[PDB]
Design an enzyme around this catalytic site. Structure first.
Site, mmCIF file in Angstrom:
data_model
loop_
_atom_site.group_PDB
_atom_site.id
_atom_site.type_symbol
_atom_site.label_atom_id
_atom_site.label_comp_id
_atom_site.label_asym_id
_atom_site.label_seq_id
_atom_site.Cartn_x
_atom_site.Cartn_y
_atom_site.Cartn_z
ATOM 1 N N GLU A 1 0.796 -1.196 0.000
ATOM 2 C CA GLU A 1 0.000 0.000 0.000
ATOM 3 C C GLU A 1 0.836 1.256 0.000
ATOM 4 O O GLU A 1 0.345 2.285 -0.407
ATOM 5 C CB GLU A 1 -0.822 -0.001 1.280
ATOM 6 C CG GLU A 1 -1.887 -1.108 1.292
ATOM 7 C CD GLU A 1 -2.988 -0.914 0.277
ATOM 8 O OE1 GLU A 1 -3.723 -1.788 -0.020
ATOM 9 O OE2 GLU A 1 -3.008 0.236 -0.348
ATOM 10 N N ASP B 1 -6.288 6.685 -5.061
ATOM 11 C CA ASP B 1 -6.326 5.201 -5.286
ATOM 12 C C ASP B 1 -5.838 4.900 -6.660
ATOM 13 O O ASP B 1 -6.000 5.694 -7.569
ATOM 14 C CB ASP B 1 -7.830 4.628 -5.486
ATOM 15 C CG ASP B 1 -8.263 4.013 -4.256
ATOM 16 O OD1 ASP B 1 -8.556 2.868 -4.104
ATOM 17 O OD2 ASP B 1 -8.234 4.898 -3.322
ATOM 18 N N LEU C 1 -8.872 4.187 2.641
ATOM 19 C CA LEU C 1 -9.841 4.876 1.768
ATOM 20 C C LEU C 1 -10.687 5.877 2.573
ATOM 21 O O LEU C 1 -11.250 5.581 3.644
ATOM 22 C CB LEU C 1 -10.753 3.843 1.187
ATOM 23 C CG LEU C 1 -11.891 4.501 0.444
ATOM 24 C CD1 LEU C 1 -11.342 4.959 -0.893
ATOM 25 C CD2 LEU C 1 -13.023 3.512 0.219
ATOM 26 N N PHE D 1 -8.464 -6.458 3.001
ATOM 27 C CA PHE D 1 -8.071 -5.084 3.217
ATOM 28 C C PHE D 1 -8.228 -4.211 1.944
ATOM 29 O O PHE D 1 -8.675 -3.099 1.965
ATOM 30 C CB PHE D 1 -6.573 -5.108 3.650
ATOM 31 C CG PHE D 1 -6.050 -3.744 4.047
ATOM 32 C CD1 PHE D 1 -5.526 -2.822 3.135
ATOM 33 C CD2 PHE D 1 -6.048 -3.386 5.397
ATOM 34 C CE1 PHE D 1 -5.046 -1.570 3.549
ATOM 35 C CE2 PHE D 1 -5.532 -2.165 5.811
ATOM 36 C CZ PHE D 1 -5.022 -1.244 4.895
ATOM 37 N N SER E 1 -12.518 -19.858 -6.154
ATOM 38 C CA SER E 1 -11.145 -19.859 -5.653
ATOM 39 C C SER E 1 -11.154 -20.216 -4.184
ATOM 40 O O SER E 1 -10.204 -20.802 -3.702
ATOM 41 C CB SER E 1 -10.457 -18.505 -5.679
ATOM 42 O OG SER E 1 -10.528 -17.890 -6.940
ATOM 43 N N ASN F 1 -7.076 -19.858 -11.033
ATOM 44 C CA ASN F 1 -8.439 -19.273 -10.923
ATOM 45 C C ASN F 1 -8.456 -17.823 -10.384
ATOM 46 O O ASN F 1 -9.222 -16.977 -10.828
ATOM 47 C CB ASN F 1 -9.339 -20.148 -10.011
ATOM 48 C CG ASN F 1 -10.796 -19.745 -10.107
ATOM 49 O OD1 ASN F 1 -11.371 -19.041 -9.245
ATOM 50 N ND2 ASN F 1 -11.377 -20.130 -11.207
#
Length: 164
Positions: A11, A20, A32, A104, A117, A132
């Site tokens: 991040e 973003d 965010l 997250f 998945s 996948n």
């Protein structure tokens, strides 16, 4: 390596309101603020989040505080989620970190959508699940990060993050 170090690689750290990969208003370690287009709406959320008048800028300290909240909430969300909990409980400590990372970035909701998945990870079919997971908007939009997370699920070790 741990969840905090991993996420902080993915991040980054920014002390000023920024956008973003998605164009959304964010601050700190991927926190965010709003999906709304006004910087003003973002500023307001920020001050609400910190409890002060920030004027779009925070300290390292305040960034890590938000980060501790976000990680805690991600874990708690996994644990409260009927679709996520069972997968989480089935996994080893390293792979658990990879699921936390997806949650997250994309939210409980988004990950709970990867039905197939999830099923494969539960079954411990590592190679199948990795193929996948790659078939997603997620992988196409943030391929370097998705590939680190994916390697982590595939291997159960931290090599993707060694480089980094």
């Amino acid at each position: 390596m741990n969840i905090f170090e991993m996420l902080r690689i993915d991040e980054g750290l920014r002390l000023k309101i920024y956008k973003d990969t998605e164009g959304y208003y964010t601050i700190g370690i991927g926190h965010l603020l709003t999906k709304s287009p006004s910087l003003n709406a973002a500023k307001s959320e920020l001050d609400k989040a910190i409890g002060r008048n920030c004027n779009g800028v925070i300290t390292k300290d305040e960034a890590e505080k938000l980060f501790n909240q976000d990680v805690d909430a991600a874990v708690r969300g996994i644990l409260r989620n009927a679709k996520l909990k069972p997968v989480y409980d089935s996994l080893d400590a390293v792979r658990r970190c990879a699921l936390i990372n997806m949650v997250f970035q994309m939210g409980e909701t988004g990950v709970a959508g990867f039905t197939n998945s999830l099923r494969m990870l539960q079954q411990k079919r590592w190679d199948e699940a990795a193929v996948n997971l790659a078939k997603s908007r997620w992988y196409n939009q943030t391929p370097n990060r998705a590939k680190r997370v994916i390697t982590t699920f595939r291997t159960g070790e931290w090599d993707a993050y060694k480089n980094l």
